Design a protein around this nucleic acid. Sequence first.
DNA 1: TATAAGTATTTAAACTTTACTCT
DNA 2: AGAGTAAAGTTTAAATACTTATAT
Lengths: 201, 181
Amino acid sequence: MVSDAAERNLAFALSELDRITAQLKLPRHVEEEAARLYREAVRKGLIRGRSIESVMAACVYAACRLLKVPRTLDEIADIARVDKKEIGRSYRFIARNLNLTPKKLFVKPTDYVNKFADELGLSEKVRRRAIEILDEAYKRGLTSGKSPAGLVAAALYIASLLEGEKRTQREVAEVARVTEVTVRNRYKELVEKLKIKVPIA
Amino acid sequence: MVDMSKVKLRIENIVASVDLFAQLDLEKVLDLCPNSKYNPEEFPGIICHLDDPKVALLIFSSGKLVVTGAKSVQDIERAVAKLAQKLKSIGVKFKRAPQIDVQNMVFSGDIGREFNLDVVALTLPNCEYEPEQFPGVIYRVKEPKSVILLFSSGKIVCSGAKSEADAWEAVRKLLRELDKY
DNA sequence: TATAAGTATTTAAACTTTACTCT
DNA sequence: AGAGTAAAGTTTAAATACTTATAT
């Protein structure tokens, strides 16, 4: 009572934000943007109905999407105190309400290609061929509706075979945070529609 | 000007709230409905599934109901009938004739051409597109208040309108926006 | 209290996940 | 390794009613 209940809830939310950024090794500018969005959600009364954990986790993801920091939602879900379903609802909800449009939140496939390729130790030759396949899939109308990470995983997979630096469907799936079946579904589709020839597997 | 000659809709689900105007003892009612499920612990009403009109009914002690699954207001009127019938058949009296209100309809449809959702989401106002969570663009119309899900195949789902006439108003608005450039 | 959200029910779209089987 | 699959889960809206957490 020298601190309103708002203030104590903000301190709790800021501790949760600090815990997430330290754990994900997120840069200061991202953490600051997450905090700014969170305060906006509070100002607009957008917390009512959902957990502070839920909302702060969504503000960190929204901040990564606004600043083009290629983190996947799952990395956050892994350390957030709530599930993907719940963080996804809070995230779509506060994005809608803070006017974070599809355009403002868009992150090019290329940025994920580089991020995932880093974790996979793949060369710039592979990155290039994958970016090339993603550009062709987009021109042909095969990308809409599909999980973007699923497409990146499958283009890296295909390109790793084609450039002799093979990685397994399971490996790419693990770093892109989707299932192997998804990588497999996109792989098949990309190979036959773009007529891609592959050594072996 | 936008040729809409290929756009079509099909009703898929109709939802109505009904006031029977009479209290009800849900335990005594459980019989009137063969296929029934009740657990006040989880949900306060009786979940009943009619067979003729293939509709699901939710009966509450307050005498009010919800009818969903219907493909026509007619199927709902019939469902409210069979039930009212079976009720008098165990000693229930109604202060008025049943009051039925269509609360929501869901339509599926096809626009007849494909779309690149990334491009659509760039200029379509009142929309969301998050392919990592759901495949379609989510378009929110203020009036008539409804939501349209637009997929890359050009198929659509319209929910929240209270009539086909209104759903078509929502779709006409979407079509008009999809035409700006 | 007055607010929201969750619990249950329906229904299509089309995508991913789950949980395996069979090579 | 990875091909492949069926069924379940994800989203949209609404009314019913009964609970639980919290804004003020």
